[PDB]
Nucleic acid binder design. Structure first.
Ligand SMILES: [Mg+2]
Ligand SMILES: [Mg+2]
Ligand SMILES: [Mg+2]
Ligand SMILES: [Mg+2]
Ligand SMILES: [Mg+2]
Ligand SMILES: [Mg+2]
Ligand SMILES: [Mg+2]
Ligand SMILES: [Mg+2]
Ligand SMILES: [Mg+2]
Ligand SMILES: [Mg+2]
Ligand SMILES: [Mg+2]
Ligand SMILES: [Mg+2]
Ligand SMILES: [Mg+2]
Ligand SMILES: [Mg+2]
Ligand SMILES: [Mg+2]
Ligand SMILES: [Mg+2]
Ligand SMILES: [Mg+2]
Ligand SMILES: [Mg+2]
Ligand SMILES: [Mg+2]
Ligand SMILES: [Mg+2]
Ligand SMILES: [Mg+2]
Ligand SMILES: [Mg+2]
Ligand SMILES: [Mg+2]
Ligand SMILES: [Mg+2]
Ligand SMILES: [Mg+2]
Ligand SMILES: [Mg+2]
Ligand SMILES: [Mg+2]
Ligand SMILES: [Zn+2]
Lengths: 96, 91, 77, 52, 249
RNA sequence: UUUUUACUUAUUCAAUGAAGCGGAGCUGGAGGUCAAACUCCACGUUCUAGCAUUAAGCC
RNA sequence: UUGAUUUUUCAGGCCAACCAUCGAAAGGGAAUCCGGUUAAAAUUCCGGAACUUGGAUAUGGAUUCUUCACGGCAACGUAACUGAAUGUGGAGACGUCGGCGUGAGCCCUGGGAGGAGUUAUCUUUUCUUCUUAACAGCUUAUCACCCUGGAAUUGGUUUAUCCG
RNA sequence: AAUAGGGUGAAGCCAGAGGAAACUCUGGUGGAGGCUCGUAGCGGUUCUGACGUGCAAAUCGAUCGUCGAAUUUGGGUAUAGG
């Protein structure tokens, strides 16, 4: 179900794909949600959720890997993490 | 074009050793020279070193595997068996 | 062998207490973008290294030569 | 290496001539994050040492 | 006659193992206080090829409990063990692949490898590629555990004996034909001088009990008594039966 | 006299740089407590390829 | 290993897993080159120019009043620019084959400055000299890495299809 | 430590063509193999050649086997007369 909600956000809302973009969006306070793939290294994972703790941002743990996280977003590449800047027509922020 | 009808990788052996031995070699030798998906980084960059050793070029993770495949069927069964027995002991 | 570029450094080096002798070498060169000029190489022999200063100006060479310590033995080549 | 100055054999950083820049960076972040979680696991343990 | 090839191996002149390239003896840690009472944690640094061995070896670094020092252990790599993995060894270690646990701490059906025959011998059973030991049951009153060995034998071991959870890596090696004499040459170039083998029936009567004759033939039963002497034990020693194995055993 | 199984010190096997053995006692978790606290278990380390060495503190 | 003591006595502080020894003139390994020289020696002699190791040791520079230096976002830079026990690493230190790339020496070749040969005829011709060591300084690179940025209309890219 | 120069052309990869799919065809690229022709090398088939009181107590000539590996080889080292 969250895959359908996440797909709608990519179609209508705003997002950043990739570790470097996600950290920038947490620094600027522009992140509404951080989604982390299951096979992300724990050190990178435990650092992203430390940034979210400082930034007061909820974190959603995707159940698939970065191959499955990429294809949910309609991409032909791998996405290890992403941040939702603007949930648009979707209601992913109210569900997480 | 298609170069060989059926020998494939065992075409390096010519006519020697017997057809049955060459087709038995072909099955396991395609597997040992294949590229596998890394369970750590997600890329298809895992190749065999020596037997039982499978390295990923990208993330430099080495995992112990089978002689000619990254995972044998027996190891996959043990992984679930160990996982199941662990749940009961830890409730 | 070390080459010296600063003329001021060379005169201070030539009065070091370990300096045995000096060599003044004259080379008849040409820059190939003009005509003949007279290059002068001042070579100071220290304990470890021979120090060379190349003076392409025929007038600065003569001024430099009389600026060396009078005690140094000088060989003209 | 014995007959060369120290600047040739090291880099001005922690673990300078021993570890690369990225491996030192990963050590620092790992040390900070893991030790931060050690405090979290301690205060949480004290939360279950007074109510349960 | 002459001293036969069986007997020349005991002197071990040219029949010792070629051990220059070997990467150390694969053993568990010495059983110490931490493993007897709790657990100790190490990290896998390397998974390496050991010449003459089908199973890869794992280099695992532990801390010394008593002095400031790192201890590197040479374990037999179980399949699924990776570099950077944390290995836990002791009584209180959890049931995860690669962890070293006492046999009594493992439930029935646990697949375990590099199992100790005796408490503290650092691993005897199920050490080759693809092999393992199955835990059959426990006898807590006598502090004993029943296991099944790769040969199919049932064994009773102390519950304090240790083993490594999982299957030894490198399995399936025998499935591929060698296809060449050169492959066996390279196989034994780093094991010992046992290849190639001349058939005793192809020798002269000095060389072997099977040598001689105007045709190549053994001449007498090739099943030899268990009580026969050295120089006679060539053939099927103490063979309970012979011929193609038909049906179950 | 014969069979079985108890002891450990002779003898035998093994390991370690002979490091934590045996018993008891402190602390919790429990039994339902029918005197009075007896019995059992545990008694500092488990998201992460970091660190831990030459005692701080109290009397 | 120090602080020593001149009291030629000591005070201690650390450790002692392993560690007799022999075993390579093709393995590992501190450091030298050029020119000349003999009847016969030369990387050994002569001339010049270097280098390493061990020891002693002064001057200059550097550093300190924010005591044990500064600069760069960073990769990292530098003339230097405390660091015991103990520990962790690196170098020593490593098969084989294939094509590709770069260099060096050699081969080939143009002009010019010399010398020799042919020349009945022809041949601006045929042959030959035109070199630069170890070492010192500056500069110079595939690979790798850093900063910026955020990529599908997927792009970059090798002889060999790998990378994001 | 050593091992000319060729032939063949395995995987993998690129492009094009055909097909509903499962898939097929073509042209390149690539450079596998106890592959192959053939030097050095290692060996020793035949002439039942020479020689056969020899150049030689095993050689000489032609012819031949093999020639990138179970290859060839120096030195060090181990194994000692039932
Ligand atoms: Mg440096
Ligand atoms: Mg056989
Ligand atoms: Mg045989
Ligand atoms: Mg015979
Ligand atoms: Mg006999
Ligand atoms: Mg017999
Ligand atoms: Mg016979
Ligand atoms: Mg027969
Ligand atoms: Mg002991
Ligand atoms: Mg010696
Ligand atoms: Mg030597
Ligand atoms: Mg070597
Ligand atoms: Mg040598
Ligand atoms: Mg000379
Ligand atoms: Mg001579
Ligand atoms: Mg000399
Ligand atoms: Mg010195
Ligand atoms: Mg400075
Ligand atoms: Mg290689
Ligand atoms: Mg090469
Ligand atoms: Mg030199
Ligand atoms: Mg060839
Ligand atoms: Mg012959
Ligand atoms: Mg004859
Ligand atoms: Mg005759
Ligand atoms: Mg021939
Ligand atoms: Mg030899
Ligand atoms: Zn990977």
């Amino acid at each position: 179900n969250i895959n359908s909600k996440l797909a709608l956000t990519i179609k209508s809302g705003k997002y950043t794909l990739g570790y470097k973009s996600v950290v920038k969006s947490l620094r600027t306070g522009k992140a509404k949600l951080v989604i982390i793939a299951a096979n992300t290294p724990v050190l990178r994972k435990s650092e992203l959720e430390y940034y979210a703790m400082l930034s007061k941002t909820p974190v959603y743990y995707f159940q698939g890997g970065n191959n499955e996280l990429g294809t949910v977003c309609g991409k032909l590449f791998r996405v290890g993490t992403l941040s939702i800047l603007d949930a648009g027509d979707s209601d992913i922020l109210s569900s997480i | 074009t298609k170069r060989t009808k059926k020998v494939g990788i065992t075409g390096k052996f010519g006519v020697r050793y017997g057809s049955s031995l060459r087709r038995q070699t072909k099955k396991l030798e395609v597997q040992q020279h294949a590229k596998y998906d890394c369970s750590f980084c997600g890329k298809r960059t895992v190749q065999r070193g020596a037997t039982g050793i499978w390295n990923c070029k990208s993330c430099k993770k080495t995992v112990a595997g089978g002689a000619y495949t990254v995972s044998t069927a027996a190891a996959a069964t043990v992984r679930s068996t160990i996982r199941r027995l662990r749940e009961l002991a830890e409730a | 062998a070390r080459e010296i570029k600063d003329i001021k450094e060379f005169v201070e080096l030539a009065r070091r207490s370990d300096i045995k002798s000096a060599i003044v070498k004259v080379n008849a060169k040409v820059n190939a973008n003009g005509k003949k000029f007279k290059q002068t190489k001042f070579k100071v022999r220290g304990s470890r290294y021979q120090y060379t200063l190349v003076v392409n100006d025929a007038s600065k060479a003569k001024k430099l030569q009389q600026s060396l310590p009078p005690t140094l033995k000088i060989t003209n080549l | 290496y014995a007959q060369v100055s120290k600047t040739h054999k090291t880099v001005q950083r922690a673990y300078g001539g021993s570890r690369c820049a990225n491996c030192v960076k990963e050590r620092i972040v790992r040390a900070f994050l893991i030790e931060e979680q050690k405090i979290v696991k301690r205060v949480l343990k004290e939360q279950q040492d007074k109510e349960k | 006659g002459r001293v036969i090839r069986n007997q020349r191996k005991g002197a071990g002149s040219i029949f010792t193992s070629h051990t220059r390239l070997r990467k150390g003896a694969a053993k568990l840690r010495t059983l110490d206080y931490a493993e007897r009472h709790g657990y100790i944690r190490g990290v896998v640094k390397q998974i390496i090829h050991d010449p003459g061995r089908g199973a890869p070896l794992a280099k695992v670094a532990f801390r010394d409990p008593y002095k400031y020092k790192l201890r590197e252990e040479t374990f037999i790599a179980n399949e699924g063990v990776y570099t950077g993995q944390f290995i836990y060894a002791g009584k209180k270690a959890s049931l995860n692949v690669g962890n070293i646990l006492p046999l009594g701490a493992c439930p029935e059906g646990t697949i375990v490898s590099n199992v100790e025959e005796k408490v503290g011998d650092r691993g005897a059973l199920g050490r080759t590629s693809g092999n393992y030991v199955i835990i059959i049951g426990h006898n807590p009153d006598e502090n004993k555990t029943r296991v099944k060995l790769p040969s199919g034998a049932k064994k009773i071991i102390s519950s304090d004996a240790r083993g490594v959870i999982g299957v030894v890596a490198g399995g399936g090696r025998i499935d591929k034909p060698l296809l060449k004499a050169g492959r066996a040459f390279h196989k034994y170039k780093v094991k010992r001088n046992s290849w190639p083998k001349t058939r005793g029936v192809a020798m002269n009567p000095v060389d072997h009990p099977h040598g001689g004759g105007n045709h190549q033939h053994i001449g007498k039963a090739s099943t030899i008594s268990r009580g026969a002497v050295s120089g006679q034990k060539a053939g099927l020693i103490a063979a309970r039966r012979t011929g193609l194995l038909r049906g179950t055993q």
